[PDB]
Symmetry: C2
C-alpha cells in the first residue's frame, strides 16, 4: 500500500475546534473517492468519527476511531493498510487529530535518564544535545509548535520538570492534525508518479506495570515492533527515522531499540552528529515531538506525513539528502505499545 497525498497543519495553541482542525487538514484530500475514514484520536464530544464524516460532507462514508493513546496514529495507519489489502476499502483517509487546549511519563523519563547515565557513563550533555538538535530542526519546520533554536546551556538551564530533566527536553501539550490518503500499490501511480510505499509495519505491546518492566534503558515493545517491521519490509537500512521522543532520553533509547546503535552507544551518535540533519542517519528531521509538539492522536500520522515529504524530496530546508527509505515509531505510554512503519520509494 502507498501514501499518495497528505495534509498537515501547524501544531500549537490553536484557535480552531477539533472539527475545524480536521476540515483544514483534509480540505484538499476530499477530491478523491474516499471510501473509509479512520480517525486517530485519544481524548474526544462523542461519536467523533461520524461527526467528522458529516462535517466533511462525506455523510455516508464509513468511519471509526482508533485509540492507542500516544501510539494511536501508527495503529490507525496499520488498520488503514489492512482495510486496503483485504479489499474492504480502496481509498482510505486516515486523520490524526487532538485538541488539548480546551508513575507519570515525565517521572519515568527521568528514571531512564539517571539509569542510562549510570549504566553507560553517558555525559548529561549528550541527552540535552538531543533537544539542541531537535529545536534546530523544528526551527526549519513551519508546522512545528516550537520554532526556536536553543543552546545546550539554555536547555540545561530551562526549568526542572523531573530531576535531572528540564522543560526544553520534553514535548509540549499541543493541538493539531495530520492526514494521509492510502491506496493499494496497483492504484498508486494513478494518484502520483512518486507514491511513498509502506514497506512493512510491526506492532508490539509490553507490560504496562511499571513495577514489572525489566529495566528503564530499553523499551522491549519498540525492539519487538522494529524487528517485525524490518522482517516484513525486507530491508536492513534506513535513511532517516521519526521517533517518539516524549523526552530527549527516549530518542536515544529508541534509536538503539530500533536497531541503529548498540545499547548504550546511542548517546555517542548524538555527540558525533550522526543523527543531525546533515549526518549519516538523521533522526527527527521534523524537530521530533521535542519541537513539533505532541497532539496525542495526530503525532503518529504526522510522522507518516514527514516520511512522505522526505522521500519525495519535498521537505525544503529540513530535507534529508537522498532519502529513499524511512522509519517512524508511534508509542503508547512508557513503551506499553509500539508501532514501527518503514516507508520507501519502492514497494
Amino acid at each position: 500500500v502507498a501514501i499518495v497525498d497528505v495534509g498537515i497543519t501547524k501544531f500549537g495553541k490553536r484557535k480552531e475546534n477539533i472539527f475545524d482542525l480536521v476540515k483544514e487538514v483534509t480540505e484538499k484530500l476530499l477530491k478523491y473517492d474516499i471510501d473509509y475514514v479512520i480517525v486517530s484520536n485519544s481524548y474526544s464530544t462523542s461519536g467523533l468519527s461520524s461527526l467528522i464524516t458529516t462535517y466533511l460532507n462525506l455523510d455516508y462514508v464509513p468511519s471509526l476511531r482508533v485509540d492507542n493513546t500516544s501510539g494511536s496514529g501508527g495503529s490507525a495507519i496499520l488498520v488503514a493498510k489492512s482495510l486496503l489489502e483485504s479489499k474492504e476499502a480502496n481509498t482510505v483517509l486516515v486523520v490524526g487529530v487532538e485538541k488539548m487546549s480546551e508513575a507519570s511519563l515525565p517521572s519515568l523519563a527521568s528514571i531512564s535518564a539517571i539509569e542510562y547515565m549510570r549504566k553507560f557513563n553517558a555525559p548529561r550533555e549528550s541527552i540535552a544535545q538531543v533537544a539542541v538538535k531537535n529545536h534546530y530542526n523544528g526551527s526549519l519546520n513551519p508546522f512545528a509548535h516550537i520554532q526556536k533554536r536553543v543552546t545546550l546551556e539554555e536547555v540545561l538551564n530551562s526549568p526542572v520538570i523531573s530531576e535531572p530533566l528540564r522543560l526544553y527536553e520534553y514535548t509540549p501539550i499541543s493541538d493539531g492534525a495530520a492526514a494521509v490518503v492510502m491506496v493499494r500499490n496497483e492504484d498508486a501511480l494513478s494518484y502520483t508518479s512518486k507514491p511513498v510505499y509502506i514497506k512493512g509495519i510491526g506492532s508490539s505491546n509490553y507490560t504496562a506495570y511499571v513495577s514489572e518492566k525489566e529495566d528503564f534503558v530499553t523499551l522491549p515493545a519498540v525492539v519487538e515492533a522494529s524487528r517485525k517491521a524490518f522482517k516484513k519490509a525486507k530491508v536492513e537500512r534506513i535513511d532517516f527515522a521519526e521517533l517518539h521522543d516524549m523526552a530527549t532520553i527516549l530518542e536515544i533509547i529508541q534509536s538503539e531499540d530500533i536497531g541503529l546503535f548498540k545499547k548504550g552507544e546511542g548517546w555517542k551518535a548524538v555527540m558525533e552528529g550522526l543523527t543531525s540533519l546533515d549526518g549519516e542517519i538523521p533522526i527527527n528531521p521534523s524537530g521530533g515531538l521535542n519541537s513539533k509538539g505532541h497532539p496525542i492522536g495526530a503525532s503518529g500520522v504526522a510522522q507518516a506525513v514527514e516520511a512522505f515529504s522526505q522521500i519525495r524530496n519535498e521537505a525544503g530546508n529540513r530535507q534529508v539528502k537522498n532519502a529513499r527509505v524511512g522509519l517512524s515509531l508511534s508509542m503508547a505510554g512508557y513503551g506499553n505499545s509500539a508501532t514501527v512503519i518503514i516507508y520507501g520509494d519502492e514497494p
Copy 2:
C-alpha cells in the same frame, strides 16, 4: 474469515471492574495463539494519560507482547471491531485475532431545522414510533409486542440483563419514557463483555470442527444530525450497510437476525432496512409471529438489546457470539431451527453508522 471460539459474561449492573469483566470473558480463550487484540469499548478513557485501556488489557491478561488497539464507533463499536479483525486476518497482518467488546457503564444527537437542539436517543425513537404509526397505520400494540417477544427470548438467555417474561398489558402500562414509548420498550444501561476468536478460513478447521464463517460485512455512515428532511422511519446507514453485506455475502436468504433494538420501534424499522420486509410492513411481521423464535425468520432470538441490555462496546461482539452459538446448534432453549445463515447489525447513535455482518456454516 471465521469465528472459532467465543466468550460471554452475564450482562447487568456488575460490581466487577472492566478488567475483571475482560478476564472473565477471555479466561477460556487465552490458550489460543492470539497475535492481535482488538478492544471494542467507547467510554473507558480514564487511563488515557497514563497507561491506555487496550495496553492495560493485554498486561492484565498476561499477553504482554501481543499488540492491541481500541476501536470506538460508540454503539456501533463491536461491529467495527469485527471488521478491523477480519481485515487484519485477510491482509495477513495477523493470524489469530481476539476481539473483546466490553463496557462498564453503571458506575445524543443534534436536531436542526430550516437554532439547535440536543436530543436523547430515546426521544428520537418516540418521534419514529409516532411517524411510523401515522404513515403506515400500524397499531400501537404491534410496537409493544416487540418487547413481549424479546423479553420471552431473553428469559431463555442466562446471560441477559433482563430474564423476565412480560405481557403486552405490562409493557403498555410501564412508565412513559418519551410519549408514546414506555420503559419496557427500551434497552437498559448495562455492564458486560463478549469476545470472539477469529482466524482465516484456511486455518478455521484447525481450531474447531464447526467454524462460523463471516460471509460478508457491509459498512456505512449517515448524516450525524437530524433535520426535518429525514423521514424518521428509515435508517439510511442500515440500508446501505445491508446492501453492501448481502452483495459481498452472495446469499439472498437468512435464517435469523440480531438487530440493534435500542427501542422496540427500531427493531421494526431495521427489519425493513436490512431487506426482510417492505417499508411499513415490519409491524405486520411482528403481529403475524414471523419474527418469533419459532417463526419463519426469528429476529433477536438472544432477547435483543431490549432484554440482553446494552453495554455500548460489548453489544456488537455479543451479537457475533449469538450467531456463532445459533449456527453451531448450541443455543439451547433459544435455538433457531436449522439455523445456517445469520445476520447482525451493530449501529452507532440514531443511525450515524452501521455495520452489518452475515454469518454462515460455509465460507
